[PDB]
């Protein structure tokens, strides 16, 4: 989404697209953190819990 056309004026148009994906996570010893298929690091052990 972009703002409608108004002459000699700046306009701001916000777009929010919810996205959900199934990614393959990987982890290595000591398994204290894991990465995702998108290359994002997650600094939490995959087995962390209560």
């Amino acid at each position: 989404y972009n703002p409608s056309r108004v002459e000699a004026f700046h306009r701001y148009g916000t777009t929010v697209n919810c996205i959900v994906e199934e990614v393959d996570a990987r982890s290595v010893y000591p398994y204290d953190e894991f990465v995702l298929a998108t290359g994002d690091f997650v600094y939490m052990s995959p087995f962390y819990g209560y």
Binding site: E33, V35, G39, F41
Partner: protein, 50 residues
């Protein structure tokens, strides 16, 4: 009576010396370990992203 070793003895047999093959132990040897090959790269995407 005289001993058996008092007379000169000549070997009537055609000696054949047989030297068995000595046991050999093979130790591990690698020109470049898998860790060295990984370290050969100037940059590592895993460490850089982390």
């Amino acid at each position: 009576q005289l001993s058996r070793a008092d007379i000169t003895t000549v070997s009537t047999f055609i000696d054949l010396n047989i030297t068995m093959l000595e046991d050999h132990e093979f130790v591990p040897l690698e020109v470049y370990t898998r860790h060295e090959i990984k370290d050969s790269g100037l940059l590592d995407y895993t460490e850089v992203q982390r």
